Amino acid sequence: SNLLLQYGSFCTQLNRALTGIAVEQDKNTQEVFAQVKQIYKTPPIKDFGG
Amino acid sequence: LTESNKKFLPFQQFGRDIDDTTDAVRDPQTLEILDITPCSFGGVSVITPGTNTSNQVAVLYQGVNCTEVPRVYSTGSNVFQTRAGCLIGAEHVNNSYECDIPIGAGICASYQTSQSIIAYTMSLGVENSVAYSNNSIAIPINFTISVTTEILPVSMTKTSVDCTMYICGDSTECSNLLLQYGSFCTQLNRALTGIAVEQDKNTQEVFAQVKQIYKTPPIKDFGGFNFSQILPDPSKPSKRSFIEDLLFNKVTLADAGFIKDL
Amino acid sequence: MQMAYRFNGIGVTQNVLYENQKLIANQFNSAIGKIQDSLSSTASALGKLQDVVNQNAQALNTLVKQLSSNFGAISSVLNDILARLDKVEAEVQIDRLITGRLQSLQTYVTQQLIRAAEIRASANLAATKMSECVLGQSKRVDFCGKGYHLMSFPQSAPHGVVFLHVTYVPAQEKNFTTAPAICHDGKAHFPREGVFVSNGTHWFVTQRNFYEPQIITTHNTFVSGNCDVVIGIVNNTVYDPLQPELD
Amino acid sequence: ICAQKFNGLTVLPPLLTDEMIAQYTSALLAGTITSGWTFGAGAALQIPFAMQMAYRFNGIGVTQNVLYENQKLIANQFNSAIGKIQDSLSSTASALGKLQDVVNQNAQALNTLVKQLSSNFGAISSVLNDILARLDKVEAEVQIDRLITGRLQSLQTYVTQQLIRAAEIRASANLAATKMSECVLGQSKRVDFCGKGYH
Numbered sequence: 001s002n003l004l005l006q007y008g009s010f011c012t013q014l015n016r017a018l019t020g021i022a023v024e025q026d027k028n029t030q031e032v033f034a035q036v037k038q039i040y041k042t043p044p045i046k047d048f049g050g
Numbered sequence: 051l052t053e054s055n056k057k058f059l060p061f062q063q064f065g066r067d068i069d070d071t072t073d074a075v076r077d078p079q080t081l082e083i084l085d086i087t088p089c090s091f092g093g094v095s096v097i098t099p100g101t102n103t104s105n106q107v108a109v110l111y112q113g114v115n116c117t118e119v120p121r122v123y124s125t126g127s128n129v130f131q132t133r134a135g136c137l138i139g140a141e142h143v144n145n146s147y148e149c150d151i152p153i154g155a156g157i158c159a160s161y162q163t164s165q166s167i168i169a170y171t172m173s174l175g176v177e178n179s180v181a182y183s184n185n186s187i188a189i190p191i192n193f194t195i196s197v198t199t200e201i202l203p204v205s206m207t208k209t210s211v212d213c214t215m216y217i218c219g220d221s222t223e224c225s226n227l228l229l230q231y232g233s234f235c236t237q238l239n240r241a242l243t244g245i246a247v248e249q250d251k252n253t254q255e256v257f258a259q260v261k262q263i264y265k266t267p268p269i270k271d272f273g274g275f276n277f278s279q280i281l282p283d284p285s286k287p288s289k290r291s292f293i294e295d296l297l298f299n300k301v302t303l304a305d306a307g308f309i310k311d312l
Numbered sequence: 313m314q315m316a317y318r319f320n321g322i323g324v325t326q327n328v329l330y331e332n333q334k335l336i337a338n339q340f341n342s343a344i345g346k347i348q349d350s351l352s353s354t355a356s357a358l359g360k361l362q363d364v365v366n367q368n369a370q371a372l373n374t375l376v377k378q379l380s381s382n383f384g385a386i387s388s389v390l391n392d393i394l395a396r397l398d399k400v401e402a403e404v405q406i407d408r409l410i411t412g413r414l415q416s417l418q419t420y421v422t423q424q425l426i427r428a429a430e431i432r433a434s435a436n437l438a439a440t441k442m443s444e445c446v447l448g449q450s451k452r453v454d455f456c457g458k459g460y461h462l463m464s465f466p467q468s469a470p471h472g473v474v475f476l477h478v479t480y481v482p483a484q485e486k487n488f489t490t491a492p493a494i495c496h497d498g499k500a501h502f503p504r505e506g507v508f509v510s511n512g513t514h515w516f517v518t519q520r521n522f523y524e525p526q527i528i529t530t531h532n533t534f535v536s537g538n539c540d541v542v543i544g545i546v547n548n549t550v551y552d553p554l555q556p557e558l559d
Numbered sequence: 560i561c562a563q564k565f566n567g568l569t570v571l572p573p574l575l576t577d578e579m580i581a582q583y584t585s586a587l588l589a590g591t592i593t594s595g596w597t598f599g600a601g602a603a604l605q606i607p608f609a610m611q612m613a614y615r616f617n618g619i620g621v622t623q624n625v626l627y628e629n630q631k632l633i634a635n636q637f638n639s640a641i642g643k644i645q646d647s648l649s650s651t652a653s654a655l656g657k658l659q660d661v662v663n664q665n666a667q668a669l670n671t672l673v674k675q676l677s678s679n680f681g682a683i684s685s686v687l688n689d690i691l692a693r694l695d696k697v698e699a700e701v702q703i704d705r706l707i708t709g710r711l712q713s714l715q716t717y718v719t720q721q722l723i724r725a726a727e728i729r730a731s732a733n734l735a736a737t738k739m740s741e742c743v744l745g746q747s748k749r750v751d752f753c754g755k756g757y758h
């Protein structure tokens with residue numbers, strides 16, 4: 001651990017970048033699927049003209 | 051260490067993962083098969099609503115069976131168990147709301163009313179049905195005109211560097227030592243140049259479509275519809291219009307920067 | 313007239329714009345006002361723009377701070393390394409220091425290239441938006457604004473572009489009983505440009521985005537087939553402007 | 560995954576569970592079979608399914624009379640085609656090649672990180688505790704140094720590769736979003752953007 005501290009901020013930087021990748025993946029999913037607010041439901045009667 | 055179920059032949063002795071690390075051992079005295087596992091670590095997340103409102107916080111442990119784990123912090127009550135990990139400072143409320151602060155695996159945290167921090171299973175939207183009768187239609191009886199907004203980044207900031215200056219300050223011997231290595235210093239500079247040029251090009255394509263600079267007629271009578279706010283005012287020294295000027299003031303960077311001699 | 317040509321595009325006939333001109337004017341003028349107030353308030357709307365400047369600043373600062381790292385030697389100041397050290401030994405410390413700094417520079421330049429590719433993508437999207445939404449009217453759903461898109465006005469901002477999209481949104485809804493086609497005298501008549509609605513008593517034809525009932529004449533219909541195959545045909549009367557003139 | 564729990568590669572779980580994702584898609588489906596294309600712009604306006612199909616047919620050019628007259632044929636044709644889709648999807652080789660590919664690629668890189676751990680990196684041993692043993696502090700340090708440099712390099716390589724791959728996945732997401740807006744919430748005139756033929 002002591003030796004690594006001397007090398008510099010080469011542990012802080014790496015951790016930050018990987019966090020970035022993860023949070024952007026969450027944004028991707030939300031954008032593609034969530035575009036309709038009011039959740040709609042199917043009519044019980046299934047009479048869609050054939 | 052635990053007792054195993056592995057079947058070692060009398061010459062065999064230790065375990066190995068694809069990582070080639072010992073996973074088991076025979077007691078050199080009882081000759082029994084034991085299984086090794088370092089204790090449970092993870093990483094720590096702190097939830098806070100923001101100092102302005104309060105000074106309470108919540109804690110999450112990125113995945114540990116909190117049925118027995120419990121850094122210098124103390125502990126307390128209100129232990130809750132998600133799939134993501136171990137929360138300390140929420141409540142399994144049976145309501146549900148819109149998600150405010152994300153946590154993971156369908157759990158979202160927030161602050162509310164005596165007021166404390168709470169948690170909930172995130173609900174999506176409000177339910178409603180659409181009466182479908184094979185002979186029913188719905189034509190709107192009027193209309194509404196609305197103006198929305200949209201922001202999109204165009205360019206970054208042109209930067210340049212110098213080898214000898216950064217790597218070897220001004221020492222000539224250091225410069226000779228850098229000269230030993232190949233054209234690393236040279237190639238680097240060219241790449242930074244490429245970025246700078248292309249960044250300027252981007253700006254041109256977006257705005258440069260008008261061939262002739264047109265000018266708005268003096269009389270501003272556009273059939274009732276006013277356009278004063280968006281139309282540039284010559285009286286204002288900066289040709290920028292009201293809305294444009296407001297935008298400029300908001301985005302501030304000189305906080306950690308300097309000025310537009312730099 | 314320009315607004316009316318654009319209205320025609322989304323579906324509503326020019327009749328609408330000309331008749332209720334005042335109401336349209338008021339709505340547009342008032343909305344522009346709210347946008348000014350919203351920009352002045354909610355100091356989070358300006359998001360993506362500030363983000364760009366924040367990232368570059370952090371990266372620059374990182375490179376500068378790394379200068380103060382032993383990188384596995386004795387000192388940081390190159391002149392101090394030379395001081396109290398024979399050239400031979402100093403060289404090995406200088407060697408280490410150089411490699412350390414060099415690595416950091418390579419990392420920064422790599423990071424910048426990746427980030428600039430994302431900026432390029434954003435600029436190309438804005439170019440398409442300017443060419444389609446500004447210099448024209450786009451029917452691509454949600455590409456410009458939300459709802460049927462009329463016109464769009466461009467404005468400038470620090471290192472970026474802000475588009476103000478103007479859109480028409482249908483509002484208050486009702487309930488009309490409908491039917492596929494109407495049979496008058498054996499031959500079936502299908503709607504020409506609208507949908508046959510019925511307000512309970514008589515039958516009328518209307519546009520598909522605004523209520524304007526007109527009497528079903530031969531001019532607002534086209535004859536085809538015989539009334540028996542159309543699944544749910546109803547029965548009323550097609551006026552036909554002819555006999556009045558003849559007599 | 561747990562073996563990765565033994566080295567420091569903690570794989571984090573999702574935020575939106577697959578149950579929630581299913582709910583979202585079902586709402587989009589139950590809006591495009593009942594309220595046409597108004598379920599994205601304004602409020603939902605009910606319309607009989609026969610009529611909705613007629614408007615769409617008018618768009619491609621064929622006049623409405625065709626749909627209302629030969630409705631029977633269209634129905635049977637559509638029903639049979641859905642049958643073929645499910646059959647073919649299950650009865651083929653890969654089909655979902657792209658989806659599977661992403662998983663395999665990410666896994667390969669992760670595995671390579673765990674393998675470089677055992678490399679001597681030009682030293683005497685792989686286990687740092689073993690290096691410490693039978694080595695005087697001074698020499699031990701210079702051997703520890705050799706190992707550290709090697710490992711640091713490997714982790715940096717991994718991070719850079721991941722960032723480049725992440726850009727690719729994000730691009731595919733932006734295309735998908737555009738499709739959900741043009742094809743699902745309406746009808747596309749752009750040729751070959753949604754499907755082969757008239758959409």
Ligand SMILES: *[C@@H]1O[C@H](CO)[C@@H](O)[C@H](O)[C@H]1NC(C)=O
Binds near residue numbers: 078079
């Ligand atoms: C070692 O000690 C154990 C228990 O004290 C005994 O059973 C065994 O015979 C001894 N010798 C060897 C060779 O294991």
Ligand SMILES: *[C@@H]1O[C@H](CO)[C@@H](O)[C@H](O)[C@H]1NC(C)=O
Binds near residue numbers: 115116117118
């Ligand atoms: C917490 O640990 C116990 C160990 O006894 C184990 O059953 C499980 O992982 C957790 N408890 C539950 C949820 O049964």
Ligand SMILES: *[C@@H]1O[C@H](CO)[C@@H](O)[C@H](O)[C@H]1NC(C)=O
Binds near residue numbers: 144
């Ligand atoms: C909350 O829900 C759980 C599970 O349904 C139930 O056991 C509990 O009593 C509920 N709490 C309240 C206050 O209703």
Ligand SMILES: *[C@@H]1O[C@H](CO)[C@@H](O)[C@H](O)[C@H]1NC(C)=O
Binds near residue numbers: 045184185
């Ligand atoms: C209308 O829907 C209902 C339910 O299926 C039923 O009366 C009938 O099948 C449909 N068609 C009519 C009434 O023409």
Ligand SMILES: *[C@@H]1O[C@H](CO)[C@@H](O)[C@H](O)[C@H]1NC(C)=O
Binds near residue numbers: 188485486487
């Ligand atoms: C249409 O009429 C029915 C008749 O009861 C009513 O329940 C429904 O709310 C009406 N639709 C709208 C949008 O008001």
